[PDB]
């Protein structure tokens, strides 16, 4: 087997010439050339199979992906492991190559306001997708967002994504949730599941103000902390806001805040584009059910020069989970990940 910093990265005859990419979330990522195709490509080494969330999040993403295929959403070209269940420790994901994403861009480069309209646009063309696909993302931010060096973009990291489920979205109030802090919709704290697809939308607005400024628009260091950065820019809440949250507790909890008022977004962001912070204040709604929907942000006229909506596929059919994962074994999922990966091999 071949080695890059001992562990074992090993990927058949096909895919030579290795060089370190970093720490992924389950092992560790490498370029690759790939023979078949003769260009460089991405590849993660993944060993989920000790721990029953990181296989979880393993398939749910494999599962996702594979059935996608859309510009603006990574593809898995191949995977790699063991032709046997018993021989199977790790699997290997290979992907397209991208030289960066939006979080590692964002750390040093100024975006004209023609770059932050194109990735939003291609941001927007691929949540259109997911969305039509019946599935939320739900951890959208700024490193699932890889970028070549040509500017397109394509969305990554489908480990927390779950097919739409509205009926079910309501929770009491504090309920714990697992992704990202500060990308996190004002409802996650007080009554939502986030099994809707508002919650994606907000995630895109709290993008959209970090390209303009370069920083986390709601950076909150704790759970509660979240909600109070986010009224402390959007201000209380109206009453017929607060009458939409029906939980006493949460809105018991707003009621008790102080008044505060809006902060404008032409003060946050004095450089920005009348029109890109129009459309801003549409994603960054309180109420999801007044939030602005992934396709009327395509049409807003931020997105004109770009917008087409013959070429903004959705997908063929909805996307349905078989079995619902939470519940699964370890053992069980990893069984699941072997079938799902079948279609790679000589066999």
Not at 224 to 253: F, V
Not at 280 to 291: A, V
Request: charged share 25%; net charge negative; with cysteine.
């Amino acid at each position: 087997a071949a080695a890059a910093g001992p562990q074992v990265f090993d990927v058949g005859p096909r895919y030579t010439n290795l060089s370190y990419i970093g720490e992924g979330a389950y092992g560790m990522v490498c370029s690759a050339y790939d023979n078949l195709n003769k260009v460089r490509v991405a590849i993660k080494k993944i060993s989920p199979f000790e721990h029953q969330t990181y296989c979880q999040r393993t398939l749910r993403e494999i599962k996702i992906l594979l059935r996608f295929r859309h510009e603006n959403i990574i593809g898995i070209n191949d995977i790699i492991r063991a032709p046997t269940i018993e021989q199977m420790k790790d699997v290997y994901i290979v992907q397209d190559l991208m030289e960066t994403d939006l979080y590692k861009l964002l750390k040093t480069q100024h975006l004209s306001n023609d770059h932050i309209c194109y990735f939003l646009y291609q941001i927007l063309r691929g949540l259109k997708y997911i969305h039509s696909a019946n599935v939320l993302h739900r951890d959208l931010k700024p490193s699932n967002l890889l970028l070549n060096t040509t500017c397109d973009l394509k969305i990554c990291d489908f480990g927390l994504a779950r097919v739409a489920d509205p009926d079910h979205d309501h929770t009491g109030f504090l309920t714990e949730y697992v992704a990202t802090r500060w990308y996190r919709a004002p409802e996650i704290m007080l009554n939502s599941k986030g099994y809707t697809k508002s919650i994606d939308i907000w995630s895109v607005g709290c993008i959209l103000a970090e390209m303009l400024s370069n920083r986390p628009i709601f950076p909150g260091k704790h759970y509660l902390d979240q909600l109070n950065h986010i009224l402390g820019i959007l201000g209380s809440p109206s009453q017929e806001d607060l009458n939409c949250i029906i939980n006493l507790k949460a809105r018991n909890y707003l009621l008790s805040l102080p008044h505060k008022n809006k902060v404008p977004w032409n003060r946050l962001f004095p450089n920005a584009d009348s029109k890109a912070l129009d459309l801003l204040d549409k994603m960054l709604t309180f109420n999801p059910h007044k939030r602005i929907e992934v396709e009327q942000a395509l049409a807003h006229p931020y997105l004109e020069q770009y917008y087409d909506p013959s070429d903004e596929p959705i997908a063929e059919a909805p996307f349905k989970f078989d079995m619902e994962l939470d519940d699964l074994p370890k053992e069980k999922l990893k069984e699941l990940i072997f079938e799902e990966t079948a279609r790679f091999q000589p066999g």
